[PDB]
Each structure stands twice: as C-alpha cells, then as structure tokens.
Amino acid sequence: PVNPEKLLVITVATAETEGYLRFLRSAEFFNYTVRTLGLGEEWRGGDVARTVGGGQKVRWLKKEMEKYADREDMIIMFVDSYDVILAGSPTELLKKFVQSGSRLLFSAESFCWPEWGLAEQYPEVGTGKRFLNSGGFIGFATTIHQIVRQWKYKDDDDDQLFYTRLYLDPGLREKLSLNLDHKSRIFQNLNGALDEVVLKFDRNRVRIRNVAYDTLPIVVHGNGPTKLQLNYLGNYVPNGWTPEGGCGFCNQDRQPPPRVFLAVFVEQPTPFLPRFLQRLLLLDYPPDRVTLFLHNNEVFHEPHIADSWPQLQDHFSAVKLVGPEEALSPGEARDMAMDLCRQDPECEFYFSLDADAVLTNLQTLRILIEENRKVIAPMLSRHGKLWSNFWGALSPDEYYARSEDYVELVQRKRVGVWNVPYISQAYVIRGDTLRMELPQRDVFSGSDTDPDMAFCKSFRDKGIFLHLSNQHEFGRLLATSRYDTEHLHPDLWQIFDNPVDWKEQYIHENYSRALEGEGIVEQPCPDVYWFPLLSEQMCDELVAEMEHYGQWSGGRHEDSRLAGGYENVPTVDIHMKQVGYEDQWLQLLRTYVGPMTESLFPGYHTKARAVMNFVVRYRPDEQPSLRPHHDSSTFTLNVALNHKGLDYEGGGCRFLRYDCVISSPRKGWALLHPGRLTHYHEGLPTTWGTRYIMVSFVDP
C-alpha cells in the first residue's frame, strides 16, 4: 500500500483563474498536496485553446523534476488545472496506479492529436481508447524525470506531440514501462467520450462513472471543446452540490455597502413598466450608493419614464437617461452602460436589469453581492413554465440546448449557485473584472450575433464563469412577445399573458382575503353579497377606455331585462364586445367572480358564462335612473367604477321585495345578487355628476 504522503500533484497555472481555483478546491477536498508551477509568469505556450502549444508546461516541469531525479519513493501526477477536477481520493488513485503495473501511465483519448498520421504506430487496443493525452499522467518521480529531461524545444511547441513521440518509441516504451489508461480507470478525457460519462451520486459527494468501461475515474479532464461539459460536471463533482449537504460553495443561509452602477434596459414594449419603475424605488440597497443608467428604445415608454423620472432623480445618487432619439441599438446601449461602470473606478459592481425582469425579492442586489462572484445572475422564470433567464447547455452551433439538470434547477429541486453557459435579463458583474479582464468596449456588439449571446461568449472566451443562483426566490420574467400597444391602457389586456402581474395591478388588494373569509364580504340585503373586486386603477382605466370609445347607447338599444311582460328596459351602455374586451372580462369572471360565487352560495356551481357584459353611464343630462326590472341571469355582478360624492351625487340599487337600499356604493366593490324571480330591483336616480358601473348577467 503506497503511502499517500509520497504522492505529489504538479500542475501549471499562470493565474488564479476560477478554473484553477475550482481544481484546487477539488484537490483540497481529498487532502491532496499540490505544487503549482508558473503562477507569477506570463504564458508563452501560445493560444492553446486555439492550436497546439503548451511546451512551456514541460519546461517548467523539467526544472521542477531535477529535485526528484533520484526519488524512486515518490509518485508524481501531472495534470492541467484550468479544465480539470479531481473526483477520487489519493488512496484510491495510488491503488489503481499500482494495479496498472505501469511506471508512468498517461491518460488516453479517442483522437490521435496533433499528428493524425501516427495512429498506425500505436499498439492495437480492442475496446479502449488508443491514443496518448498529455493533460494527465502519473508515475514514479524517477521515470518521469527520464522523460521530461529530454525536453529542449520552444515554449510554444506542442507538449502532447513531445510525449506522443517518446511513447511511440517501442524500445523506450518497453524500457521505462510506459502505458496508457485505455479504459479510463484513473483519467477521464471528455473530448470524444461525452456519451460515456454520467454523474454518480452519493450522500455527501458526487463522482463520475464511465458507462462504456464501468469505471470510476479519479481525474476529469475537459480537454478541447468540452470546457462547458466540465463546467456542468464541476457543479457537482466532487462536493459542489450533494443530495444531503446541498451546494458546497454557495452562501446558503445568509459598514457601508459597495457602490453600484444600476443599468436598466427597455429594448421592446414591455407590460407594466410603470410598476417596474416604481419597483426601482423599493430595492433594499442604500440608494445613495447606487447610480442609475436607463436606456429606453421605445417611444411608447417615454411618458412612463417621464412620470417616474423626478422620483428616481430624487432617490438615487445620480441618474442618466438615454432615450429613443439617440437611436442606439441594444448592443450599443449595453456596451455604453457597461463601459460607464468600467471607466469609473468608484463603480465596484455593475447591475444590469432588463425591463421584463420582475424582482419580487427586494434583497436581490445584496444577496448576489454577498456571493462574491465575478458574474452572477438571479434565476428568473416565466410564470408556470420552464423558460428562464439562463441556458444549462449549448448546441454544437452554440445556440440553445436543454441540459440534463435544467428542469431540476428551474423547478428548484436542486438549489445552489451554478456555473452555466448563458445568462440574461439580470446579472451583477464585478467592476474589477470589467477593468482587468474584459477591457474592450465591444462586449455586446462587434458581430452579427445577437447582443445577449455575444455578451456570454465574451466572458466564456476569457474563462470567466457565468454563475446562476436559484438559492432563493428572486422573481419572474414578463411575457412581452405579443404586447398589443394599440390601446389607451394596453396593460388592461394583459390578463392572459401576465396573470400574476395583472392581478396585483387590477384586482382589489383585499379580494384574496375576502375570498378566504374573515369578515370582509358583507350581505347588506338578504341574498345580496358585497365584496371587493377591482382596484381603483382598474376602475379608472376601464372607465377611461369606455369614454375613449365614445359611442354610448341611445334610443332603440335593447338589454336583456325583464319588466312586466316585456324586455324593454334599456341603459346608456357600452358592451365589452364593442371595445374588444369581452374575452378579457370573461377571463376575470372565470378566475375571480366564479369562485367567489361558489363560496357565498354553497351548492352552486359556475363556469361564469355571460353574454351580457357592459358598462352603464348614469347622468342627469341623459339617463339618470333605471326602472324596476329583473335581470336575465341566474345571478348578477354589479361593480361600481367611481366614487359616490366625488364623481356623482345619486342613489345606488334598490331591491323592492325587501325595501333594502344600497345607498353608498364602494368604488372597487361588487354586488352579487340573484337575477330572477325574487330580486326585482331598481337603479335610483343619479342627481349630479356621472355614475359608472360594470354589470354582467352571468349564467343565463
């Protein structure tokens, strides 16, 4: 049993990148001892991501090995560090190395690289990997010194070609007992074997298994174009996220804060923007520490921005607006806002927030800053769907692809902080990173590629991790796809596309409490119920939308009201049909009125059918009253729309068989009463002003 104290891991790293630090964390988890070569130096090995190179690694290793040229008692493992993680213990590693019977065991891979022509010189292997990969090897210190000392080449010559040529010397291969880990017992190279690797979970750690050979590799190498697949594995292996411990590097459970540049982007017509702008004032972060940049590309939103701007200017440390007149593209505007933070050494963090992002968590900015990442996004999801502001995987064309764990993350079955290839709509970036690592201005622009993909590719090309937190509930994404802007108040028509935000804006704030009981719903007249339904904003916008239509009812108009033996009781009204709001109002009936009716009339079941939906206008100048009648409905919904006293002086509704009067209606509240037989009712005259009400004859 070889002593683990005799094992030394050697790797090369010119900077403490996130990949190098990810490697070190995996090494410390198994109590390895690591020696890092080259931390101070500038990299002369070439563009190794692009082409051959890395000879500088062999030069540094050769110098380091002269210490141990005679140490037959020492086992040394050399691995890359930027794209490698450790998945097993030194004891298991040394056990498998002895089992191999080799004195220097190289990792194996599917491709003969760089010189494909040398594939014939390799020994035949039946089912395993045939060719050498220099990203990982392990052997006696003496044997390794005999190989690396033969290096006398350029810093940008290929390291793998150097090792391949020595391995293909049959006499040297037999002399020094050189071997390749054909079946990935120790080394797993991902390039060319992605379908062979799966995650194997345990209680408090995660490994990988090669299902082609049924092995549990020690070293995971994301060589070549498998960096993102390694990022995926590195979220779990070895202690990134575990079934019983949760994530291993997140904050989990949570004197002046850093100064922040907050950039807001309005690049399309987006619903509920006045609500978004008001929400900026509620973010829980000292506003004197926040600088606001807002780009609006939409002339539709200029009035919305103008209403909010006095409050925003009075709130934040400094504000700046770039409107549609500047004719900035989305990529140009995002480059401008980011470079404003980059060129200001007082900007410690950059917070980009798009208009379709709804932050329900007011501590979002704090939470993300505590995570101490270069780049991190909060997970935001379109309500009740899978689409969200990140991608778990990339297609070979670098377009969208679904990762194996994407649904678990979106549904928050696994929570933590995740290294992902794509983020959008909301993220926090270290200002230091913009200055020192992404100094160029063309982050979002410079090519035909879409700005938000260019942004993510710019960071991936520099080896910067894009982090995503679902550790908390942060918010949601608004649907903006088919936002019909040709209305006086377009957000009235948003009941289908954004029902959660629609409810918060237009449904009475005390509706939900009344639906659950606890003494809000009133019964002012025998079987007449009274409950809050619409918010004042809903009432004002519905009335305004009616007057904007303008074509109120007149003579020869017929409503479905029963008086005596004739249905000849009319009102000056506008039906939802004529303004194209019928489908919308019927959705409100199904969702909010239906369930309220079934609760107040136990035993009755409703699907909220209604062909008669209309707003009535009472005025002394035209039609101030409504004579006694029955409604052609099973029950009737009657919603006030303005204020008694402020907007009109006049009575409400009188139920004659009870001599009961609703004399003071409440603006947001709705009356619910039977329509036939028993509640013969009358609309008392409006004596001054204008009285608006909304009425539906439901279940006729």
Place this chain on the structure above:
Amino acid sequence: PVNPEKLLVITVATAETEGYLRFLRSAEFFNYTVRTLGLGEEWRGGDVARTVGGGQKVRWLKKEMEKYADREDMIIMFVDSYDVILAGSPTELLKKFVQSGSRLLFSAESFCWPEWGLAEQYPEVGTGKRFLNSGGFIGFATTIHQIVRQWKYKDDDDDQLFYTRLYLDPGLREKLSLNLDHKSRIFQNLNGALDEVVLKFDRNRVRIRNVAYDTLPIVVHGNGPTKLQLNYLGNYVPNGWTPEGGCGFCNQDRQPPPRVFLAVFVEQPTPFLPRFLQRLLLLDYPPDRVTLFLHNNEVFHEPHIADSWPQLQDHFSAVKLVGPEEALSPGEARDMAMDLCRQDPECEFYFSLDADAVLTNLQTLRILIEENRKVIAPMLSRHGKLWSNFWGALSPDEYYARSEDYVELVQRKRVGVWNVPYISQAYVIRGDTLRMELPQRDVFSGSDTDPDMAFCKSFRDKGIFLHLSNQHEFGRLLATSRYDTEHLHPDLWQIFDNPVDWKEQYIHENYSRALEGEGIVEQPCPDVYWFPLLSEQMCDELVAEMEHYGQWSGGRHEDSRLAGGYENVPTVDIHMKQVGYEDQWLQLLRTYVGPMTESLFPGYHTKARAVMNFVVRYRPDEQPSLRPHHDSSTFTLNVALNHKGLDYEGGGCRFLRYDCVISSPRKGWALLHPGRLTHYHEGLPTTWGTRYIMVSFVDP
C-alpha cells in the same frame, strides 16, 4: 168621440185556460169590459187547431146579440180568446174604428181560407191583406146582429166560411158597409205576416208595430200555426215585461209546504254525481214533505248511488231506486216517475231534476212553487256559454231555433218568467195538471221523437204554457259530452270541461281567500312561501291514481336536479306524462299556481311552463330521503299529498343556506321557493309509513 162605455168585447172560451187568462189580463190592463160566452159548456166546434170549425162560436154570439139587436149606440168587438192579446186602449180602438168609416170591420189576412177558390170574388187591394179572418171583427151592435142572425148551421161548420160568404155578397157588402182591415190598423193576424210584426217598447208597456204598413195594431191574433210566436209576443205585450217595471206577472221580490215527488234521472255518465247526490240533502225544503224517485241507467254510477242511499233513505219521506238492471229507456223511466205522482193524490207537485243540473240556489223548489204555474223550469246555463235548458223558438220542423230575445234572457239582461216552447233538465209540474189535463202515460214515449221533445210537445198540444224563470240565479248545467270514464277517478280529468265544479271539489277551500291576502299565506323560510292549494279529496285521488298505475321509478331514472357538477339526483317518482295527466296538471298550474306566484313575488310574470311534473314516494323500504340539490327551475312547487303522523313519520324539506326546516308539512298546502343558486335544499328521511308529494319545476 165614441164613448168607451158603449164598447163591449165578446169572446168565447169553454175553459179558463192560460191563453184565455192571458187575454183577460191584457183586457183588464186597458179597462175593457169583456163578456165571455160558453165557459160552462163542452166544446162542439171540432178540432179547430186541426181543421175547420168553430160554428159553435157563431151560435153563441147570435143568441147573445138578440139583446142588442136595436142598440145602434153600442159598438161590439168579437175576438178569439185562446190566441189573442190586446195591445191598445178602447179609446184608440174606437178612434180607429170611426176613422175606417165602416159599420162592421173584419180582420184581414194573407190566405183565402177555407175555400181558396173564392179569392177571385174578393175586391182587389193594392198592397194590404185581401181576405177575411173571423178571429176578430168590430162594428155596431145592430149591423153585427143582422149578420150573425143568419147563422143556422152545425156547431162544427166553419165560422170563417160563414162570414166570408156574407162578405162576398156585393150587395150585402155595400148595404151594411162591411170592410176588411187591410193594413192591420186594428187587427194583426200573425199567420203569413211574421216578418211584418216587431215589438215596440215604451217605459211601462209594450206594443207591436207592423213595419210593412207602419201601424200600431190593437188586437194581436196568433191564428193558425203562430201560437208560439204569440206566446213570444205575450211575454211583453202589453205589460208582460217592461224596461222600467220589469216583468208584470212574476213574483219578483219573494203553515206546511205542499208534498212533492222529486224524481232524479241519471241517463248518461255524468261528472260529479257524488256531489249531486250530497246536494239532494241540502235542498231547502222540509224533507218529510218530499218523496224521492231515482232512475239510474248507468252501471258506472251504481257505486255512487249505493254510497249515498243510506243518507237519502234516512232523509226523505220515502225513497225508490230503479237501477240499470230494469233496462228502462229514458222515456220509459220519465213516464214511470211522472205517473207515480199522477196516480198519488197526495203528490201536489212533481219536481224532475236531471243529473247534469247543478242547483246553486238551495231555495229553487220553494221559489218555483211560489210562482203558482202549471209548469215552470229554472233557467240553468252551461258555464260561460249560451247553451241552456230551454229554447226560445222552434224551427218549422219543430227543432231548435234561436229566438230574438234568447241571448238577453240567458245573459239575464231581461229577467222574469217567460212562456217558452221548450224546457228541460229541471222543472216543477202541478200534480193537478197531470191528473186533469195530461192523464196519459205516454208523455215522453210513444214515438220515435226524442223523449224531452215529446214531453214539451205533449204540453204544447194541450195549450199548457211551459214557463221559465231567470228571475233568480238558480244554477248551471254540467258538460257531459265527452266524459272519459276509464279512470280510477274520472272527475280528476274534468278540469277543462267543468272548471267551476272541478275547483270546488279539488282546489283547497281556503285557496281563494289566501290568493286575496289576509294572513293565510305563510313564509316559514326566507323566500319560501306556503299556501293551501289542493283539497284532501284531490290529494287522496291523485295518490290513488298513482298507486293504481303502479310503475314507480327505479335505478337509471334521471330527474333534472343539480348537485355539485352533475344532474344525478333521482327519486322514486311517477311523472304526470306516464299517467296522461300532464295537460290537466299544467292547466292547474296556469290557473291557480301562476297567479299565486305573481302575487307573492311582485314583478315576476309567469305562464307556468313546466316539463318536470311528478309525484314522489318516500319509504324507509326503498328511497326514504333526497340528498342536497338545486332544482332545474326558476321556482318550484312542492305539494304534500298525505298526513304527517297518520301516513308517515319523517321530516320534510330543509333549506341549507338558511338552516330552516319545514318539519311538519300540511297535506293540502304547497311550498313555493326558488329553484336555483340560493335555495340548496334537502329532503329529510321518511322513517315510517309512506310520504307522497307533488312537485313541478316551473319556468325552466
């Protein structure tokens, strides 16, 4: 101006018949002085109604005139008495006689009778009547003596031929100044001139006018086959009935009573016969003075007669039943009952009452006896129509015809006692008249003619008046035309044909009072009303009709009840459709439930539509209860049909939204409640016995 004291009216009458007495009354009304010849004697003039004769009249007149052979100061008018009425005063008569310039003026007529061949010998008259009629003439006593003294012929030779021959002597006609009243200035003979005669009314007397000649005759003569037309005129002329005095000979405003034979005839299946038999016990006339004869031709009515017979035998002085086993024809039975009174000298009055006659006036028998007529019928009319138990006129074939005043009599615009050609269904006949004037047994029988017409013709042939009183309200006639006898209780199906009697038998006696208000209708639960609807007899017969059908509901039966989201609430029931009682029950809803609903729910209008009408049976053995549900109706009618405690031990109806229970239902009473939304209701379990209810889901 000729003195009225010098005028003597002479007539012939062998008996004081009603026609002779009618003549005398008209004569006394104008203060005429009348001398009647022949009152003691037997008539030897022959069958004057059949053929020629009446020479006995001339013989008596000749003897009488020998007193006045020299009295040139005396004017004498000879007229028949049985078929003559006086319409004008002696002053007007004497004025018109002088105006004629005649010394003996005969009445004129259209027909040359008896010898038609003598028509050539008559003088030509342009437009008036050409021929002599001996039924009336007026002239100086001396001139009349010169003519009548030439009589030397048989008692059964023709009187008119005798006068005609003397008038056709041209020398004698010129000598004695004989003339004919060509234009009916004094005498109106009806035969051949019916279209010329109309009634002329005044305040307190009635005359006739001849519209062909524009005259106001003094003497109205119903000669030949115009006796019935004279009967018609005699109801008015001269003081029979007047616009301001009413009728002139009726009782108008009303110690042992006479003994009466009451005969009841059941000659067809007739509705509500048990009610008729019970009504016999309520007639206001001392029952110890009444003998009962009842002929039933219907085996259908044998059980009805049997139930009533102990009460009738205990009530009246004597009773006798002749049932269907005797196989008597209607004419044979009516002859038998009438001859029973005829052969009993203790029978002072005979009262024939048919089963379709409903006597609402319990004093009918008294009232008619006070009228002191030989024969009199009470006017009885089929409800709301013109058909009644008398004819005002006869066709030439002696079948039905409408008289000019028939509608005024039936509608009681003119009330009184009327001489009519036909009566039926109810009449009172003097026993003396049966013994002395109609002694034969074949009154109703003896010929192919219908029995009730034979009866009337038998009296008309004897000159007996058939009187009819509409001076009071007496009752009505039941419709019996299409009485469907194939039911367990056929009178349940009588709602259309006899609605007044149907209501009194089956509608709750206190229903009408409740419909008018005054604290009968109750509201035991909020909008649930409770009112008496059906009588106990209706409930018992409806239940019995249901069990007689027997085919109650079972598994897979579906009623239109709403529970949760499904219409799967069934009951063990029988619908009115399956027993053929739907149309009948719908008529009850329209007539009685509809108006009750519109009164209790002001503003609601109903036509009482209902497709779901059914009787429910609750039993512990099968289905004792009914789970909570809504009815598929605007409102629901729920009628108990038997007794809580006596027939079943179990709860009634529970309305859950009110925690209100109808624990003790009332047999005849009905519940009225809304069917949808608000009155979720439950049928509490029946724990013992059987519970029957009737329910209609109206206005679905």
